[PDB]
């Protein structure tokens, strides 16, 4: 369907323990395909999915240089942020940034992203127009003024609408057998007596890709949102994801409950019941 390329940057200061570590990971949808870590013995942009391995030395060299420059920029940014918040030199702080682009089923740009957080709180973001910023506070307004003066948004828009989308489309073609394959969940319902009075019905979805999925329980056709325990979708380690949803039901009322599953890999949505 639609697809995204995203890079996730984390920089973490550690006073007294050297310079801040910088790590970048790149994803196409739910698939990681590159990493760069300043704490590696020899920092380098490294392949993390088989389909990216065919890129030639120019790709590895250029991305390693960009990431080494970014290590320095993020360390300067962390020094600046400690000042903008009047913080001590003693504490550790975190700067995160995510950026990238989304395309629709025909490869056309849907939208771009570039947004940053400091100590886990939103700091500044490029608006969806790719032309203006939203600053969270008066510290981020300093960054916004600097980026307005330097016409940074125009540079990011050129990247997002150009390089980013072109590379996403290239990756989607090179990895078409996996990136453009949706694996449906394998689904089943388990039953776990709790007491004489109640039992848990757990609806499982296993082996699916990508991670977006809808998994719900209904009782007599009504959604049970407040009474359902829904675990976070979790990686299996083999590219796929897992999830389950559980409801506590009165003993004898199991057939009033239905589990409903929607996912891209399924030809039609599923309705399941406990099958004793």
């Amino acid at each position: 369907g639609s697809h995204s390329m995203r890079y996730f940057h984390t920089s973490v200061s550690r006073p007294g323990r050297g310079e801040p570590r910088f790590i970048s990971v790149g994803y196409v949808d739910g698939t990681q395909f590159v990493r760069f870590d300043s704490d590696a013995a020899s920092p380098r942009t490294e392949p993390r999915a088989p389909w990216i391995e065919q890129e030639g030395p120019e790709y590895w060299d250029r991305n390693t240089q960009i990431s080494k420059t970014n290590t320095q920029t993020y360390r300067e940014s962390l020094r600046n942020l400690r000042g903008y918040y009047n913080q001590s030199e003693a504490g550790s702080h975190t700067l995160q940034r995510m950026y990238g682009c989304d395309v629709g089923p025909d490869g056309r740009l849907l939208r771009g992203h570039d947004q940053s957080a400091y100590d886990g709180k939103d700091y500044i973001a490029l608006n969806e127009d790719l032309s203006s910023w939203t600053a969270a506070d008066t510290a981020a307004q300093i960054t916004q003024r600097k980026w307005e003066a330097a016409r940074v948004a125009e540079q990011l828009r050129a990247y997002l609408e150009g390089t980013c989308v072109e590379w996403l489309r290239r990756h989607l073609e090179n990895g078409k057998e996996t990136l453009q394959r949706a694996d449906p969940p394998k689904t089943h319902v388990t039953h776990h007596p709790i007491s004489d009075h109640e039992a848990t019905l757990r609806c499982w979805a296993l082996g699916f890709y990508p991670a977006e999925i809808t998994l719900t329980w209904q009782r007599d056709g009504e959604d049970q949102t407040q009474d359902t325990e829904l675990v976070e979708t979790r990686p299996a380690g083999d590219r796929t994801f897992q999830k389950w949803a559980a409801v506590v039901v009165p003993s004898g009322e199991e057939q009033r409950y239905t589990c409903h599953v929607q996912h891209e890999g399924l030809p039609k949505p599923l309705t399941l019941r406990w099958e004793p």
């Binding site: 890079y7 940057h9 970048s24 790149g26 942009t45 790709y59 250029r62 991305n63 960009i66 990431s67 420059t69 970014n70 920029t73 993020y74 300067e76 940014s77 600046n80 942020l81 700067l95 940034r97 950026y99 940053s116 700091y123 500044i124 960054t143 600097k146 980026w147 330097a150 940074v152 540079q155 990011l156 990247y159 390089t163 980013c164 590379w167």
Partner: peptide, 8 residues
């Protein structure tokens, strides 16, 4: 390919 980011 990645982009060179800008100092905050």
């Amino acid at each position: 390919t990645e982009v060179e980011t800008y100092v905050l």
